[PDB]
Design a protein around this ligand. Structure first.
Ligand SMILES: [Ca+2]
Ligand SMILES: [Ca+2]
Ligand SMILES: [Ca+2]
Ligand SMILES: [Ca+2]
Ligand SMILES: [Mn+2]
Ligand SMILES: [Mn+2]
Ligand SMILES: [Mn+2]
Ligand SMILES: [Mn+2]
Lengths: 232, 232, 232, 232
């Protein structure tokens, strides 16, 4: 029974358990601000420093995980509300894409919108080049910001959002429950073979980005994660 | 849309917002006790008074829901730790089956192990007449305590267990995440067509039971719920 | 060597190993409930029936001990979360203070806040008359609820708290480690000469109290203890 | 508040959350075996892969921690039961000393017995060159195996030992409670200023060593740990 679990009610630069990549910054209130408001094509990501072992090559087993987190997205004059926040899983050596153009890549992909990761995006800008739905949406991404499945959603400025994810190794199901501040939930599920799509050792985290004309405040308030791998 | 949400940090017999059936009893500490330690084949169930419309006959749309709750089970001398607690959904006219024998029926089914409901059971005794696994387990039940699927588990006496349930209407996937005391998680997901196994309006609740020799403390400590039905 | 060790997974009103003073009661779930939510200035205490021998008047040796216990304090309307729970050591002839006004006395001291006892309090009310810290806290008491030393701590309603206490005779140090719900830990330690402040034979226990407007649920869930005195 | 916490019921080679050094190895039963029974001057160390911030140069605050573990030491033919096990804290760059003779260095010091670290040693061999008590013992070490303090103890072959250490940042007290196979406890405390002896970032772990003729089985069966540093 191999398990990894942690709980951040607040963050702080200096905390060895966190990996800061790009324009990431930490506010005097413990919140993490992923993007820089004055940087074109801004990209900021935060990662759990310790690489998690999601599956065993020996046992063929795959872990299951439960994780919750809340974020916030507030607008700013006079930019467009973009681009979004994505919770992703990736190889332990994951770094912000080379020459990342930010924007609809969410900091996890290249220009064509491709990359090595599995995530749940909170897209606030419709990028047709990635086949984005017409309105804001929550999506399951598999090596591409061109979601495998999306669900109509609405990002409310200044609103605090709570999300809960559950990956069941057996059914290979990734279910997501989004709680808007109006008390309404939005759910989206999709089967994803992590052992097929990702390497044994991965890292979890968040990524947010902006463009020259589209920018907004992306904040990661709290995060709790628990994964268990049936070993021997 | 149509949303139903509520949070119970404690309970108190006096609030018409919750139905009590059978040997249920509410302790001075706010914990709901489901069975009676001094009665044979005891059965206690608790239902949220308001019936939840989990689907519409106009649109055909089904509701999604996110619900978390914490139970507790503890042994007693000299009796066997049985039979377990079950989180269930049933028609609003649901009641404890006529001439209930408690035991392995968990208070939701008849002798053959049949009933009209959908639920997540936390079974602590192996009933062979129902094809129970040899060890403690979590299972997805559909009109039968002969689980549709189960996952090995272990009930730690005196331990408070957290559980989070997500039902995604689009995939009709009910996935469960049980947070054990030692920290490890256990998951189980199964595709259940709620709109085809249940009526327009249902009641969500808990049930536990016992037998002649099998008895134990079944406690519902807290329960949060949110469901949203997309409407026209 | 002379060793004393016991363990309680649950308690039962009517058990020879424990003394019940005041409004203490045992619930069907095995929990010891110290105070009566309906009484005024309610006080309840529990003691291990067998008096433990912490030191010898022949050898001069003082014993060392390791004891852990889990408790729970939950809010009730429309009173104030008061007054607290205190793990204490005292003469074997200890009794609830004559005419105890409950409240900030925790049922171990008198109006002025003095008594014969050494203990670790988990204070949820700020009694200025006893120089209490402005927030909830944990204190080491020596014959007075006017703590020798205290540490900022937050009592979370309905949360099960785990406490570990180690008393090292050699250094006469008494250190405590309290486990909070959010997983964080709080500690406190202070040199206390049990030999000079208490009798050779003492009784270990818990006590809680409330006032007219200050009341809450005070539960002692479990408790393990092991002391060893070097003899001849 | 910055908090690191984990719980290992068993171990498995492959878990990235663990750093293995030297002759360490993981048995099929989940137990970590520290030393190699066929090597001379064998040394094996295990560490929590993640560095823990025990203090901040900014705030100047020192964290507190609570940790529990259990080990085993079974004798073997035809060698002498040595050298023991030590729980230690060291700079994150910590590795087994270059050219370790193992033996009484317990794997954390040079031939003279010095090194950069703090630990609680469970010494099973009397090393006069390090001023060891004449019998088995437990000692608090500060940059040297020439313990700052020791207390007589007995290492029972094949016996499972339970240990609990509490560190209070305020008093800078490190207290240890050892529970023997016979239910007896042993304790030892010492004020150790971790901010004065170690760097801000450290690693915790276990180390065991053997010699030419002195060898035994050193097992680490379980380990739980939690520390909190009050941040700004
Ligand atoms: Ca986009
Ligand atoms: Ca059964
Ligand atoms: Ca007070
Ligand atoms: Ca030695
Ligand atoms: Mn998208
Ligand atoms: Mn079953
Ligand atoms: Mn106080
Ligand atoms: Mn030594």
């Amino acid at each position: 029974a191999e398990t990894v679990s942690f709980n951040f009610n607040s963050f702080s630069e200096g905390n060895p358990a966190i990996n800061f990549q790009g324009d990431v910054t930490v506010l005097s209130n413990g919140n993490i601000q992923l993007t820089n408001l004055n940087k074109v094509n801004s990209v900021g990501r935060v990662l759990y420093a310790m690489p998690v072992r999601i599956w065993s090559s020996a046992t063929g087993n795959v872990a299951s995980f439960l994780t919750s987190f809340s974020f916030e997205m507030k607008d700013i004059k006079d930019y467009d509300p973009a681009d979004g926040i994505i919770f992703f899983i990736a190889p332990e050596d994951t770094q912000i894409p080379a020459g990342s153009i930010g924007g609809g890549t969410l900091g996890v992909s290249d220009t064509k919108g491709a990359g090595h990761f599995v995530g749940v995006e909170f897209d606030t800008y419709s990028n047709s080049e990635y086949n984005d739905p017409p309105t804001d949406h929550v999506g399951i991404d598999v090596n591409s910001v061109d979601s495998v499945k999306t669900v109509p959603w609405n990002s409310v400025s200044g609103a605090v959002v709570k999300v809960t994810v559950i990956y069941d190794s057996s059914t290979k199901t990734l279910s997501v429950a989004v709680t808007n501040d109006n008390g309404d939930i939005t759910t989206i599920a999709q089967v994803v073979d992590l052992k097929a799509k990702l390497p044994e050792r991965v890292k979890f985290g968040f990524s947010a980005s902006g463009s020259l004309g589209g920018r907004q405040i992306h904040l990661i308030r709290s995060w709790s994660f628990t994964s268990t791998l049936i070993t021997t």
